[PDB]
Structure 1
Amino acid sequence: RHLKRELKRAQEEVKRIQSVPLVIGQFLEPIDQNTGIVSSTTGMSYVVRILSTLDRELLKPSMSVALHRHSNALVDILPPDSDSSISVMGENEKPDVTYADVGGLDMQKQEIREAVELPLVQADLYEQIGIDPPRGVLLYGPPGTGKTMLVKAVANSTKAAFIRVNGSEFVHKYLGEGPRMVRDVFRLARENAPSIIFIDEVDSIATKRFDAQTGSDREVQRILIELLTQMDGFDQSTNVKVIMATNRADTLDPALLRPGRLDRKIEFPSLRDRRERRLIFGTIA
């Protein structure tokens, strides 16, 4: 009965170490399970003991985590929903464009209701036939085709989480900032599945020619390599794999467009016919 007093005084001690002030690192992988490798957010690797009596159920896949200050020890885990680069936008109000303002481009509208909308609501039609749904969606054309207008149209009607970012949000400016944000975006999406991820322009990141003689080429390049390895993990999750767009498709790096990441290429014509130009006039009129 005396030792039940002593188990309580030892339990108190350790809960104070769990709590604030803490720096936030990331868990890469275990080397045992009582010891792991974390990269702090100073751009260095540390080998740290792991507080036994913790959940490794979400821990083993790479995911944010809390560390102690001087001690440097993993004293608790953080939700993959928490410490994210961007709050989801599916909870904010919906984009202002609806399908009444889409006029023409009716040919690309039947290839986007199939590729995006149908695999979220009904995963069970694809699997029972035995076909694999298209993975990533690419949009490309001249810079006026109103690519973004079609994406807003599909964002109002689905009423599922949305995550909207750019490809200069990932811009390098601290050490190791660029690789860190790519992890946060793919882990939020699995957590609140289903969802549609849009990267608006990705013309600067995908470069056909690197030389890697300057630091700024080594940050662009670490980001892009990380982006391929996270599109692989993203397979077999209800989320329809990342939509992305480019204005000039002829700078596109070859590993990105390769199958296993992007499969569909929705070209956006600009000639069109007389029945599809009429509609564009009719909604602006």
Structure 2
Amino acid sequence: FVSNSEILKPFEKKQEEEKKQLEEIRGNPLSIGTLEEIIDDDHAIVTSPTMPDYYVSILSFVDKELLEPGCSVLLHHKTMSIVGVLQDDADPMVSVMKMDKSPTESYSDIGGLESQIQEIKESVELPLTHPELYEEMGIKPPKGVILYGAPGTGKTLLAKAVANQTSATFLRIVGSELIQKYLGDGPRLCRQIFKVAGENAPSIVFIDEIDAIGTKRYDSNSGGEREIQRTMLELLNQLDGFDDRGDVKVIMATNKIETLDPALIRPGRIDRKILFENPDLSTKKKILGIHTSKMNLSEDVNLETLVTTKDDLSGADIQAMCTEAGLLALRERRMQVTAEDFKQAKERVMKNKVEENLEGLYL
């Protein structure tokens, strides 16, 4: 306040000549629109979301090189004349746009996935954190990454953990939003994804849970659609046309890649296929160590005691099993789970859950 009063305040107070009247003569009101075409004759065409498309003129504010068609600019309401230029982010691009900063997940909180960490790191984090390794080899790092698993563990923890170490903004695009059920929205929304990340590139593109655009079938029925056929082709042109050192990656995870277009596959652009694997007992020790730092455990029970019984659970239900372990202690009126509570809590978990039995009694 003291500095701005003795520095920035006298700058505007002492000398007032121009920049005050630039927004006056042209017009006071403002109606946002998009430039259709730009020329040197000081005339253009603007269209507001209400569709009052007219033919107006141009006055000199910014040079014509800065004015580009397809971006939101500074306009007038009634006369619709161009009063300036604005930022293009006001133009609606994708119906669902989620930009997350500082993701909470990291490599330490995802457990024993280091087998799959080195895979996702080499195709995403390694070219971002070490661009000189792929430059000396004279090769282009893979842009895409194929993932397998379930939401919350395989298709979630792996995506958010990389954005933390890469210091990139988390950008999520729903796979179903790529197809709006309208002809022409397929190629339009795909180009706008690379446009936001195509300036400073301080982010990484993430797409999860594709049950739709991943399968075009043979027709517009049986789960496929005709707009999906031509949308996956334009995404290929946007994948090859996109060129950088790896600051931005496109990570898409679906259930099956057999229905994908061999064009969009394009071997050499996507070198990474990560299939969901069943973790070993060492994975549970890393997940327990996080929650045992808060919840106190008895001295007679260590990390080797809880890992004894583990049946088909990777990383997700270890927290859910410890939730019941802390809930049973509330019945005994105590805030610290002791050895008597561990035995009765794990029996209520491992039992009465999975009805189907995989057993070697086929004999």
TM-score, normalization by structure 1: 0.69
Distance 1:114 1:169, change over 3 A: same
CA distance in 2, matches of 1:76, 1:182: 28
Distance 1:129 1:163, change over 3 A: same
Distance 1:114 1:12, change over 3 A: same
Equivalent residues of 1:36, 1:47 under 8 A apart: no
Q: Does 1:20 align with 2:30?
A: yes
CA distance in 1, matches of 2:91, 2:22: 30
Gaps of 5+ in 2: 1-19, 289-363
Distance 1:11 1:140, change over 3 A: closer
SS of the residue 1:201 aligns to: strand
> How far has the Cα of 1:221 moved from its partner?
4.9
Q: Does 1:51 align with 2:58?
A: yes
Q: Does 1:89 align with 2:100?
A: yes
CA distance in 1, matches of 2:23, 2:157: 57
Equivalent residues of 1:142, 1:248 under 8 A apart: no
Q: Does 1:131 align with 2:131?
A: no
Alignment of 1:59-208 (within 5 A): 59-60=67-68, 63-66=70-73, 76-83=84-91, 85=94, 86=97, 88-90=99-101, 93-95=102-104, 97-140=105-148, 146-172=154-180, 179-208=187-216
SS of the residue 1:227 aligns to: helix
Distance 1:123 1:99, change over 3 A: closer
Q: Does 1:263 align with 2:270?
A: yes
Equivalent residues of 1:166, 1:200 under 8 A apart: yes
Matched with 1:4 is: none
> How far has the Cα of 1:88 moved from its partner?
2.5
The percentage of counterpart residues that share the same residue type is 46
TM-score, normalization by structure 2: 0.57
**Given residue 197 of structure 2, which amino acid in structure 1 is its aligned partner?**
A
SS of the residue 2:103 aligns to: coil
CA distance in 2, matches of 1:69, 1:152: 44
Equivalent residues of 1:136, 1:241 under 8 A apart: yes
> How far has the Cα of 1:51 moved from its partner?
2.8
> How far has the Cα of 1:198 moved from its partner?
0.2
Matched with 2:247 is: 239
Q: Which is further off, 190-199 or 168-177? A: 168-177
Larger Rg: 2
Q: Deviations over 1:29-69 (max 9, x none)?
A: 76x565778887579xx796673634454555x64223666
Q: Deviations over 1:209-228 (max 9, x none)?
A: 35469xx9455456444433
Q: Deviations over 1:109-143 (max 9, x none)?
A: 11222221232234344324423222222223677
Count of residue pairs the alignment pairs up: 262
CA distance in 1, matches of 2:66, 2:210: 31
CA distance in 1, matches of 2:98, 2:151: 28
Q: Does 1:280 align with 2:283?
A: yes
Distance 1:143 1:159, change over 3 A: closer
Distance 1:245 1:73, change over 3 A: farther
Query: Larger % of strand: which?
Result: 1
Distance 1:142 1:81, change over 3 A: closer
Equivalent residues of 2:142, 2:272 under 8 A apart: no
CA distance in 2, matches of 1:50, 1:136: 45
